[PDB]
Design a protein around this ligand. Sequence first.
Ligand SMILES: *[C@@H]1O[C@H](CO)[C@@H](O[C@@H]2O[C@H](CO)[C@@H](O[C@@H]3O[C@H](CO)[C@@H](O)[C@H](O)[C@H]3NC(C)=O)[C@H](O)[C@H]2NC(C)=O)[C@H](O)[C@H]1NC(C)=O
Ligand SMILES: *[C@@H]1O[C@H](CO)[C@@H](O)[C@H](O)[C@H]1NC(C)=O
Lengths: 138, 406
Amino acid sequence: VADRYAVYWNSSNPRFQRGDYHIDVCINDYLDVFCPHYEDSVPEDKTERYVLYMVNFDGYSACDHTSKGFKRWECNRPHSPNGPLKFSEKFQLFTPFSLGFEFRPGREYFYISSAIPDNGRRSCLKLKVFVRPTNSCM
Amino acid sequence: KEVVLLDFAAAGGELGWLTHPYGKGWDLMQNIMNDMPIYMYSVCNVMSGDQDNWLRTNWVYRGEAERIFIELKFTVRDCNSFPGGASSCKETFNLYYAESDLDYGTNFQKRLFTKIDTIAPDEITVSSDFEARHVKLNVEERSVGPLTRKGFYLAFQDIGACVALLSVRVYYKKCPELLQGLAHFPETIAGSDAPSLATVAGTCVDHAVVPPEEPRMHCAVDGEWLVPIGQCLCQAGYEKVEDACQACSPGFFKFEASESPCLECPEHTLPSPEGATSCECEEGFFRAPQDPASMPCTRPPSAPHYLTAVGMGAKVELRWTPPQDSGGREDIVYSVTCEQCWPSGECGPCEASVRYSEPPHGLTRTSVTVSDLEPHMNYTFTVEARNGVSGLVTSRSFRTASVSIN
Ligand SMILES: *[C@@H]1O[C@H](CO)[C@@H](O[C@@H]2O[C@H](CO)[C@@H](O[C@@H]3O[C@H](CO)[C@@H](O)[C@H](O)[C@H]3NC(C)=O)[C@H](O)[C@H]2NC(C)=O)[C@H](O)[C@H]1NC(C)=O
Ligand SMILES: *[C@@H]1O[C@H](CO)[C@@H](O)[C@H](O)[C@H]1NC(C)=O
């Protein structure tokens, strides 16, 4: 966990259920984001499904994905075959895809979720990500 | 038709090919697109100057293929749309290849490769195709031959550029299994040289064959067939149908080896069964030794319709009309005979002492003139209408008359 930072995105998480979950990655480090995985012994209603979004500060703040912000990942598979549905991100300065996204060293970035079943439209989950600067990664 | 050795595209991003050097070079991203999930193998060390970033496809088993067809899809980003912009970057990378007889696993060897082309973009993603989120995608293509060894590798070189491998897709080429004119042709594999014409012996479908020219086909490098030489014909009793060869209906036939269908049974002829060579003849009708079995059923000719004998002067002119039933033919030959019933009474055939103006038997005319005669005689005469089938008959057919001169 020196290049690759992992996080499992399910309501039953003690860092998220707080509200200030936040992390420190470096330029060229990854961010694996594992959805809520469910054994076939889960009755559909108790299966968490979300829709990940990459937004800014405001977007991070008022849990609002309508104004501005990307839609980056999607946990519609609570029943994925080989372990949990993975959604990865690399914090590299520069990206050769219109698709992809770029990451500045010593800015911070923000991610937020809204359940696919839609459940209680007011609060929600959220990660903050600070980028250690050019030379504070060691 | 094409046969595929590889499609990183549709591998739902689970292939993961060896990178080099040890993960500091090429990298794999996921990403949304058209709402569906897609993965790419990208690099972007424009800055780090001295490069050499390889990315090496697994191990493709050769198979039958001898010239393989590589087809990469990819976006390349522009070098002026970089803000820092350290101008050691580019938009050209390198395609390679390795023949091996044994997956070297995750052993890797640069020198071991030879290079195909330096692929480059037909569309640079520039600082604007970003703001909009515009996807400047490249389809470029190449291939190489011919491939001798068990199995081969691709692999890519990056000298510092902002590339991003969307699709690798490898496939080769065979010419479709084919029915073309009563010969069957394999499905069979193209080949390496550029004017390489596959020569493929055809084989004749059920019921058909070669008259002398051979059935043959020509298979190109693009997996196409080309110079139809020859054919096969629906044989003795069968008629070509579609690309089949169906038998001759109820009451038809086909005698020889022909491009022609089934001629319906002629006349005087019994409603043949299924697929009859020559048509079956009716009781009371015939055919000759030099006859076609198309030339219907015939019978010997009825006797001249009309007989007379004009005793014109001293020489009797013979004059007779042609038969009322030809026997459906046009090949009748009149044969004529003679006698001497003298009154006296003793009857008895002529003497060659008499003279004519034409030979006795086989007459394509209806008249002659008998000079050299004996005044006073029930001079009996008889002409006969005979054709060609007039030998499958003892039962004669003739007509007769008599004359006496003075
Ligand atoms: C919701 O969140 C829970 C807490 O965040 C998850 O609990 C985690 O499950 C992980 C995997 O199921 C565990 O990580 C594993 O650790 C073991 C031993 O260290 C390793 O063998 C595994 O490699 C590793 N992960 C993998 C990929 O197998 C965590 O230990 C555990 N974390 C905690 C603190 O509870 C739940 O799994 C998750 N539930 C749902 C519904 O998604
Ligand atoms: C010969 O001529 C007679 C007439 O005298 C005719 O009736 C007869 O047909 C002829 N002979 C025979 C064979 O009857």
